[PDB]
């Protein structure tokens, strides 16, 4: 149920069967790209929600709470990249 | 060129060819699916927030809104778009 489980399964695959490497490293590359684009948009959405709240635009606060909730759910599945460029999960996040 | 559907069938072809892989790689496929769905849920929410901003005519955040549009369009290049009949379809 974590992004890391998926990463490890791909690698385990072409470790065990090397003929799958080119293909599965391709799949890993796409999963990596998808996670990156998602986190890019999520950060932008978070910045938009900060704008809303800082401006006192309470009419949109529900959608902002939704965004908060969606980000927290995402981090559970995918963790968070720390200051050193390392993706970490749970209490390792702080 | 880099497409979600490409990733998804790479997994299926793998366990097709080596059934001992099905448990782990189908789990992997399920996680990739869940990631796409969660991202698309947030994206749609972000879109409606930009929609609200633009209906208020708030120019201060128009830049962020146009960034959202740019990101949603790049996403559809990779992951396609679900049409009204539930079929994920990729730009032609």
Residue numbers in the entry:
A (entry chain A): 3 to 96
B (entry chain B): 2 to 93
Q: What's the publication's text?
A:
One mechanism by which phages and other mobile genetic elements are able to overcome the CRISPR-Cas system is through the expression of anti-CRISPR proteins. We show that AcrE1 binds to the CRISPR-associated helicase/nuclease Cas3 and that the C-terminal region of the anti-CRISPR protein is important for its inhibitory activity.
The C-terminal β-sheet region is unusual because both sides of the sheet are exposed to solvent, contrasting with typical β-sheets, which pack a hydrophobic surface on one side against helices or other sheets. We also examined the packing of the C-terminal β-sheet within the crystal and observed no contacts that stabilize it in this position. Residues 82 to 90 form an antiparallel β-sheet that protrudes at a 90° angle from the end of helix 3. This sheet structure appears to be stabilized by multiple interactions between residues at the base of the sheet and residues in helices 1, 2, and 3.
